[PDB]
């Protein structure tokens with residue numbers, strides 16, 4: 001059952017994929033990786049195929065490849081990107097040096113669709129419903145997206161949404177620097193490294209997406225980390241003494257206390273004309289103290305989603321075993337674990 005593969009040059013690299021995959025063409029400005037759209041003749045689905053190129057060139061690359069393939073194989077929810085196929089042209093471990101990952105092709109990301117545009121309330125309901133329903137799941141598997149922004153929500157022409165990139169986020173100093181969308185969605189505890197963080201960081205990010213869809217404006221379009229934080233504290237207010245205690249970075253805690261105290265603003269005088277149910281929800285997602293933000297499961301029950309909420313159709317995941325993260329292994333060792341996971345792979349129905 002080893003299929004026939006054919007060769008094609010795309011993205012200035014040779015792609016070698018099963019015959020079932022036809023009409024490959026690069027998508028994104030290169031924004032998503034080496035990703036091509038293709039037709040799967042075997043399932044009749046349009047798919048995105050991502051080739052990981054020379055993916056075991058270092059220990060850190062052999063472990064990312066493994067981590068992405070683990071994450072991907074774990075996720076089976078309508079609103080989360082998952083694997084329809086993984087393959088390699090390799091006939092053995094010896095020969096293993098390329099992994100291709102196949103998932104659904106939705107066609108665009110939220111970014112392209114809505115940039116600079118204000119969405120109607122029922123449109124925002126449905127898109128955020130799906131983000132929280134997707135995140136309910138992610139979070140139940142004990143995984144943290146950590147980098148939830150519009151560009152890595154994949155959306156089709158029916159405004160159906162799959163979340164991309166959960167658990168992989170590792171931007172450098174310079175990608176996070178200045179006036180850049182790659183930071184406008186980050187929870188302050190994470191942008192400024194205040195504490196040992198958990199999953200509540202992704203509900204902060206939904207709060208930012210949700211406000212932008214509702215007003216057509218970036219919520220916190222900071223020109224740098226500090227300017228962005230100043231933008232944050234002015235709306236939600238400066239930390240209380242409760243929160244300052246939980247800020248384990250003494251360094252960051254000391255700079256925070258430097259700032260002149262400000263009250264939390266009135267969200268109804270910010271989000272003028274907006275469904276009060278939207279504003280109530282914004283209010284409980286955009287709380288500075290991470291321990292007190294609303295959760296994905298709690299938010300799904302909120303009245304604002306009265307029209308979509310079904311408690312028996314909002315599933316959870318099995319646990320995700322990330323014990324491998326705390327493990328220091330050789331290149332061959334990650335490679336072999338990654339091989340194991342490819343050949344053991346089972347298609348969905």
Ligand SMILES: Cc1ccc(C(=O)NC2CC2)cc1-c1ccc2c(c1)NC(=O)C21CCCC1
Nearest residue numbers: 032048050071105106107108109154164165166
């Ligand atoms: C092909 C692919 C493989 C993996 C991941 C991914 O999320 N990995 C991290 C979760 C571990 C995302 C895509 C990917 C990248 C870009 C797109 C799609 C899929 N599906 C799509 O529809 C698009 C192409 C049009 C914009 C979104």
